[PDB]
Amino acid sequence: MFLFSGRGYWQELIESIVWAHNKLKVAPATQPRALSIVQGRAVGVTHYLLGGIATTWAFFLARIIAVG
Amino acid sequence: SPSIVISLSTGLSLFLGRFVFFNFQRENVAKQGLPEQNGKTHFEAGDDRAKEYVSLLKSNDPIGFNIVDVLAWGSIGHIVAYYILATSSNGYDP
Amino acid sequence: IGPKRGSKVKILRKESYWYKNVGSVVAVDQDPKTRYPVVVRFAKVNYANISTNNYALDEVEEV
């Protein structure tokens, strides 16, 4: 989700969400902003690596504990 | 007797068209003019096949009954008569 | 020549980030050959981090 998409779409969606918030007088002082490009790429690569490594870890440990 | 039913329905529809509903239909048709594109009728915009057939619609009737009205009212009468005949054909009951 | 300093004005420029919002007038330039004399300051920053803007006479309505 982070690896494939871009910032402008998320900013434009947050605009409408912020309008819906401001309609009910609950808008924050710290205006929400979409993540920068570099942050998006970093989040994507971090999640990708974590998921792959955890998959391999679980598979290896389960197999070798069960049969070993 | 299909002939009597068909003739009666056609005559009733023709009478209703000619003597009852004529003025309302004529006024409604006059209210909704010819279809327009960009503020101009189809014939004006440059379409030659969309010309109205003024010659056919002219009639010697005192009020203005023409061929198209005859065909439409006869079609409605025939539809009603054939529906009546088909419904009376079977014996279904609720 | 225009709205007084310190007044509150509502924006009518569609392209501005502060459209249909309120802002405070800082100063109005007196030169007749300036197209956008009114200077407005807002509370919130736009996508660029600036917080000041210029406007013409008819794009801002007093409130």
Binding site: F4, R7, Y9, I17 | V5, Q37, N38, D47, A86 | -
Partner: protein, 733 residues
């Protein structure tokens, strides 16, 4: 004007390699061609339509000819349940001896391909029994393709070229399409069903040579004109009738029996003929609504202008919508695509529960393939509808001429619609994922009784209302005494109730706690895809981050790194993002259908009912369990007829994995690599005598996104098709 892109000089001036790519890409976009006008655009569209018709007719002619020539139709019609259909022959120099030995299936003398398209049953039902009929049909369709091409060329000529005012004559086109294209075609198909198909089902061979000397009904046309139409339904086919022979038959040609044929588990042909007759009558009556040259009828603009609510709750109402729709082609394309997508989904949902072809319910692979194919086509069409709506909003919308009508009010309050779509999607996703994870953890800890299972009460009540007595409710048709039961009992209920209350068929299957979560997941997918597409369509003209989006066009890369960075800001990028969600939702739907039906066919329905409530059940009892025969297509010990399916499985995996290249890595790195490679080629000996004509450059951004999306889709489709066909063909049940 000189290079290959003759329709655009700007694409011909530049010397890089992107000229070829963008010349191929924008060949069909007639609006951007230089020196273009309305007349040329309309005439080109007309010629393209004719060419497409020719292509379709040639395709079906080729299918018919190949089935006739290399197939076993004659041997199949005798023993439908014990012969595998053959699509066409296989000739391959790369094939080894075991491959030739293993692929020889059916009664052929060489390798063949089993046809899962299902045309055999259709052609058998419509009344074809020998290969001469197929050859005749092939010749006829070849003639139709030829005449289509000839007509296209003729209408591109200067003398027979139509004018723009002819193309915008909406009322006449609507009248002719509603009366001539629809009603008359249905009437002619009813005539064919009465004259050829029904007598061919009772053993009488009616063909062109002798169709004038036979009477479809002994009474003739007398009852139709007299008024006693009931004579056409006096003697229905007996319940012991055998398809294709003259044992236990009748003489009626128009009935309202309902239900399924006992032997073939398909709809009766008389019902189909009656349905077509009624539909044709309705279309013929309804096609006379609109005004034409004869001085009577309706005018569409006056119909639209008159529908404005007093009190101004809708504003100006529908004023000015007629010219907006007529002057723009993308509005028409969007409406047509939306209607076609809904119709395709209807076809996919109906053709599996009420099959109309003989001996098709017993062919499981054909049913699965047809359902999946039609659903994927429907999804793609529905995405295209929103894409063209966004294009219309970018190009053809005139704000001044549509002031305060429904379109302006829609552009006014996009924020509320977007916010509510976001809320609905968030709600559905949160709670569905929560329920699934809770059930999964409860099963993991070893205590299944702590699960959360919710009965779909409303759907079961609907099924009970339809006439199902498997739950306990007694409402409407379920109750013995009711106005509806009494009203409909005398005509169609006796067959419909028997058909619906059996357990073999797929009509209104029993549902439990497992279907609830899957239906909610499907709803979540629909809502999220709709949110993406609607946001892209509504924010096309402008937003707060960039209030002049209409100047740059429908598709443009970005707007630089300023203002925090604006990537994927155009509407093209919204469509490119929504394609993924469309694929995911369609995949969920197809997975659900395939697993439910395979568990039903295999004999036991408890496996699905007990393993569909947690995700490990889907991962273990559906994919892992069913891949056993598919992955064993070829092994070190040998190979069998499933080898090609395993090869295509791996091919789809490879293409899907290759898509990640273009979907992750971006341009600058590759441009630098091309720089270095160009230096290396220029500096080497014996190879600098050869020089390039086009300077090599890396792909653009939008082009790379498109290529990655295409790879993703191709891999997805091929992998799922291979898995589905192989898994359903391995067990044949």
């Amino acid at each position: 004007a000189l290079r290959f892109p003759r329709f655009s000089q700007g694409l011909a001036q530049d010397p890089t390699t992107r000229r070829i790519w963008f010349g191929i890409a924008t060949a069909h976009d007639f609006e951007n061609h230089d020196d273009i006008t309305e007349e040329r655009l309309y005439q080109n569209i007309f010629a393209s339509h004719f060419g497409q018709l020719a292509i379709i007719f040639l395709w079906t002619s080729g299918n018919l000819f190949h089935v006739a020539w290399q197939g076993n139709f004659e041997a199949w019609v005798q023993d439908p349940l014990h012969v595998r259909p053959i699509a066409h022959a296989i000739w391959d120099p790369h094939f080894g001896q075991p491959a030739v030995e293993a692929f020889t299936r059916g009664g052929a003398l060489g390798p063949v391909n089993i046809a899962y398209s299902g045309v055999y049953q259709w052609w058998y039902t419509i009344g074809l029994r020998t290969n001469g009929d197929l050859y005749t049909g092939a010749l006829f369709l070849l003639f139709l393709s030829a005449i289509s091409l000839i007509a296209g060329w003729l209408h591109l000529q200067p003398k027979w070229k139509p004018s723009v005012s002819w193309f915008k004559n909406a009322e006449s086109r609507l009248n002719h399409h509603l009366s001539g294209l629809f009603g008359v075609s249905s009437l002619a198909w009813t005539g064919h069903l009465v004259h050829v198909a029904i007598p061919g089902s009772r053993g009488e061979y009616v063909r062109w040579n002798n169709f004038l000397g036979v009477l479809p009904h002994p009474q003739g046309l007398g009852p139709l004109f007299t008024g006693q139409w009931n004579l056409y339904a006096q003697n229905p086919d007996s319940s012991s009738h055998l398809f294709g022979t003259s044992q236990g038959t009748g003489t009626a040609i128009l009935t309202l029996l309902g239900g399924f044929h006992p032997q073939t588990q398909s709809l009766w042909l008389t019902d189909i003929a009656h349905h077509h007759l009624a539909i044709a009558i309705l279309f013929l009556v309804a096609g006379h609504m609109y005004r034409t040259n004869f001085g009577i009828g309706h005018s569409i603009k006056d119909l639209l202008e008159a529908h404005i609510p007093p009190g101004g709750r809708l504003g100006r109402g529908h004023r000015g919508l007629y010219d907006t729709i007529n002057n723009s082609i993308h509005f028409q394309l969007g409406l047509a695509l939306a209607s076609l997508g809904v119709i395709t989904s209807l076809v996919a949902q109906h053709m599996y529960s009420l099959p109309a072809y003989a001996f098709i319910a017993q062919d499981f692979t054909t049913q699965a393939a047809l359902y999946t194919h039609h659903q994927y086509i429907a999804g793609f069409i529905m995405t295209g509808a929103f894409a063209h709506g966004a294009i219309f909003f970018i190009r053809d919308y005139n704000p001044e001429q549509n002031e305060d009508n429904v379109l302006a009010r829609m552009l006014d309050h996009k924020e509320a619609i977007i916010s509510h779509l976001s809320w609905a999607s968030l709600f559905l996703g949160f709670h569905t994922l929560g329920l699934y994870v809770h059930n999964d953890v409860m099963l993991a800890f070893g205590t299944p009784e702590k699960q959360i299972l919710i009965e779909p009460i409303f759907a079961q009540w609907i099924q009970s209302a339809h006439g199902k007595t498997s739950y306990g409710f007694d409402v409407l048709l379920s109750s013995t005494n009711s106005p509806a039961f009494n009203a409909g009992r005398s005509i169609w209920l006796p067959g419909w109730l028997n058909a619906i209350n059996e357990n073999s068929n797929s009509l209104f299957l029993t549902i439990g706690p497992g279907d609830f979560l899957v239906h909610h997941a499907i709803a979540l997918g629909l809502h999220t895809t709709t949110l993406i597409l609607v946001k892209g369509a509504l924010d096309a003209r402008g937003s707060k981050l960039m209030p002049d989006k209409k100047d740059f066009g429908y598709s443009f890369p970005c707007d630089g790194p300023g203002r925090g960075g604006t990537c994927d800001i155009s509407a093209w990028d919204a469509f490119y993002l929504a394609v993924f969600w469309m694929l995911n939702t369609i995949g969920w739907v197809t997975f659900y259908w395939h697993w439910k039906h395979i568990t039903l066919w295999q004999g036991n329905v408890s496996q699905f009912n007990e393993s569909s409530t947690y995700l490990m059940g889907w991962l273990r009892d559906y994919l892992w369990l069913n891949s056993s025969q598919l992955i064993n297509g070829y092994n070190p010990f040998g190979m069998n007829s499933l080898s090609v399916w395993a090869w295509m499985f791996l091919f789809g995996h490879l293409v899907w994995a290759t898509g990640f290249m273009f979907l992750i890595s971006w341009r600058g790195y590759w441009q630098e690599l091309i720089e270095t490679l160009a230096w290396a080629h220029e500096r080497t000996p014996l190879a600098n005598l050869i020089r390039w004509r086009d300077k090599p450059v890396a792909l653009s951004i939008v082009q790379a996104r498109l290529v990655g999306l295409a790879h993703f889709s191709v891999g997805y489709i091929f992998t799922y098709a291979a898995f589905l066909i192989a898994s359903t063909s391995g067990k044949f049940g």
